[PDB]
């Protein structure tokens, strides 16, 4: 297969290895009690948490002391020294003496910064808060609340890719420092995912067709159906409907749950994944 190297970033079980819609792929202990926490190796572009219909609430600080949970968001409340939110330049200055951290790309730096804050009195606790990086403001928001969904017939909330979240990047403690090379980001224009069979790229044999007005709506649908760790039995390990072939002519999102192993050059298609940014395209067919 001449596509092996190129296609490695689309093997979501391997490269990401946890849920996408809801990432709770590991467990960590804080003072004798076990907690679930995000563990995906790739950044999730465009993911936010919608709280009771609100889109501008989840990055607000969490409720402080004698405040109700619904009165706040999910982010770290004000600290001394102020470590959240923190601009990219702020983080680079905060870590100026640490040569192993100060020059990390902004997404890895935000993950490492959130992961630096141990809530336990024990130095060996593996509990590492996730974070959201906002590309518009270049601000890392550490998330005090690691939960991503609480739905069903208060504090009701769900993960989503919404136009208001298009510049947000959801980051677990495990985001890899070379995500730019090994993780998806851009949608592939003029390409559709396929399966390599006896020297040819064959179509995915079975797909689930959802109608979609544009690429954003297709990416949103793939995200909705993607790997989810929401209730070891609950862990996806990255298995799910993580890929879609968007046909821009018929306005169809062809969603599937097997990893793709090649690309087909087809001008009617754009290849997307639940991790991918909901807008950005790359038009360089390899």
């Amino acid at each position: 297969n001449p596509w092996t190297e190129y296609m490695a970033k689309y093997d979501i079980e391997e490269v990401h290895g946890s849920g996408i819609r809801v990432d709770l792929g590991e467990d960590a202990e804080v003072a004798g009690t076990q907690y679930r926490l995000p563990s995906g190796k790739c950044p999730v572009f465009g993911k936010g948490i919608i709280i009771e219909n609100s889109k501008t609430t989840f990055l607000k600080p969490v409720a402080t002391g004698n405040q109700d949970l619904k009165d706040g968001g999910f982010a770290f409340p004000p600290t001394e020294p102020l470590i959240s939110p923190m601009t990219l330049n702020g983080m680079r200055d905060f870590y100026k003496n640490n040569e192993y951290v100060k020059n990390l790309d902004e997404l890895t730096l935000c993950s490492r910064h959130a992961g630096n804050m141990n809530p336990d009195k024990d130095e060996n606790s593996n509990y590492k808060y996730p974070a959201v990086y906002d590309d518009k403001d270049k601000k890392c928001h550490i998330l005090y609340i690691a939960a991503q969904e609480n739905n069903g017939p208060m504090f009701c909330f769900r993960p989503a890719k919404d136009k208001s979240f298009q510049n947000y990047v959801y980051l677990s403690k495990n985001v890899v420092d070379n995500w730019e090379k090994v993780c998806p980001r851009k949608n592939l224009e003029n390409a559709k995912f396929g399966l390599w069979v006896d020297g040819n790229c064959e179509d995915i044999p079975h797909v689930n067709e959802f109608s979609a007005n544009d690429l954003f709506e297709c990416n949103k649908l793939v995200f909705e159906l993607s790997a989810s760790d929401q209730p070891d039995r609950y862990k996806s390990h990255g298995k799910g409907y993580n890929w879609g072939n968007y046909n821009r002519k018929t306005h169809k999102c062809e969603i599937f749950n097997v990893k793709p192993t090649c690309l087909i050059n087809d001008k009617s298609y754009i290849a997307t994944t639940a991790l991918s940014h909901p807008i950005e395209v790359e038009n360089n067919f390899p």
Binding site: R36, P77, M117
Partner: peptide, 25 residues
Amino acid sequence: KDIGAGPVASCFTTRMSPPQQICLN
């Protein structure tokens, strides 16, 4: 706990050197 409910924390100790105590407020 099954949906990601987390610990109640007021102060944090940095993991990377130099270790420092960062508290809420």
